[PDB]
């Protein structure tokens, strides 16, 4: 639907204007929303070119359709973020702004995925090559040529090989792999996650111990936020953190303090994260993840168990791994506000609530006196 791409242009344009504001003060540093959106628009025009005449193939293409749906949602969400946050947007350190940053990361991830599926504007998803032969077999085994699969399809397919303990691990995990934040998993996102958490053999264990349980891990963080967050530890060298690399999607980015008192960041090209992090502790560089005195022992990921509590998965999610999700289920979008208390949640948890556990709010117990529908929580 050109009407689809049209409609989406108008919205993206509105976001560009909002973001061009002088009071906002965006730095050109990746991820840069002011490049991301016109770039996305331009790739989409490319694709539209290739399918002139053969536009029904496109109309049938599930991925493109799903992509457009999510492109609209996210721009609409960014537009209302500006409306609800108002003057907050111009405060560098505000939570509404922080949310702007997160959306910049998502737009970045989305574009990466779009080009990876329609490179040169040509649908090559049904021909996509996963990097790890291990993971690649898993996908074609479970999903054949599919480009995307609903999260739940994916969760149950994955479960038969790598055991997923609970609904919290599953939500902590979805938060990690679902980069486009749309409850689908694409062959592409699959690809990145399996790259980031190699080897496939100990996939979830690596993820658990590297992402979930590791306090050096920063979810949804950018190069500049890293360099920003290691400021209080400029004076405590060996302080380090890490996050997904944004420009080299699928790779890691360790930021760290030096004895010199400056902040560098590096991308291990091949070598696996725990090894990189092991040698790194060893050779005296990465010693204090997020400034804390105790650095985790990761040997054995190279080969005993130990367990992540529900408390811990709840922390990981609570601490920004999720984007605009209900804090109750950590699964559904926050789409509703409770009055008078003002607490936000998804309608799925609220409905289940009012009908089974009674008229009080889930977080604070105050009587639900009314409801406003919402599209974004600038303070998520």
């Amino acid at each position: 639907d050109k009407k689809m791409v049209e409609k989406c242009w108008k919205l993206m344009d509105k976001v560009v204007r909002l973001c061009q504001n002088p009071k906002l003060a965006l730095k050109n540093s990746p991820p840069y929303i002011l490049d991301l959106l016109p770039d996305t628009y331009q790739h989409l025009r490319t694709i539209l070119s290739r399918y002139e005449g053969k536009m029904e193939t496109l109309g049938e293409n599930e991925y493109f359709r799903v992509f457009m749906e999510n492109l609209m949602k996210k721009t609409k969400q960014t537009i209302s973020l500006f409306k609800e946050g108002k003057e907050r947007m111009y405060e560098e350190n505000s939570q509404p702004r922080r949310n702007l940053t997160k959306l910049s990361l998502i737009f970045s991830h989305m574009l990466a995925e779009l080009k990876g599926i329609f490179p040169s504007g040509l649908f090559q998803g049904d021909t996509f090559r996963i990097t790890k032969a291990d993971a690649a077999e898993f996908w074609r085994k479970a999903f054949g040529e599919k480009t995307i699969v609903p999260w739940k399809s994916f969760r149950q397919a994955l479960h038969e090989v790598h055991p997923i303990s609970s609904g919290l691990e599953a939500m902590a995990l979805k938060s990690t792999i679902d980069l486009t934040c749309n409850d689908y998993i694409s062959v592409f996102e699959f690809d990145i996650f399996t790259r980031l958490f190699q080897p496939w053999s100990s996939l979830l264990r690596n993820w658990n111990s590297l992402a979930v349980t590791h306090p050096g891990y920063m979810a949804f963080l950018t190069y500049d936020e890293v360099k920003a967050r290691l400021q209080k530890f400029i004076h405590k060298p060996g302080s380090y953190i890490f996050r997904l690399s944004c420009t080299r999607l699928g790779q890691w980015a360790i930021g760290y303090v030096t004895a010199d008192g400056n902040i560098l960041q590096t991308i291990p090209h091949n070598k696996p994260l725990f090894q990189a992090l092991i040698d790194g502790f060893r050779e005296g560089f990465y010693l204090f993840p997020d400034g804390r005195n105790q650095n985790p022992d990761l040997t054995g990921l190279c080969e005993d168990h130990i367990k992540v509590t529900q408390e811990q998965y709840e922390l990981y999610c609570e601490m920004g791994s999720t984007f605009q999700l209900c804090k109750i289920c950590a699964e559904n979008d926050k789409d509703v506000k409770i009055e008078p208390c003002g607490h936000l949640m998804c309608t799925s948890c609220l409905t289940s609530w009012q009908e089974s556990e009674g008229q009080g709010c889930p977080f604070c117990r105050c009587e639900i006196k009314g409801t406003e529908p919402i599209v974004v929580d600038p303070f998520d």
């Binding site: 540093s29 190069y223 420009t247 400056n262 590096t266 291990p268 790194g280």
Partner: peptide, 9 residues
Amino acid sequence: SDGYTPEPA
């Protein structure tokens, strides 16, 4: 300062 450096010694 704004770029990615090689992995430390």
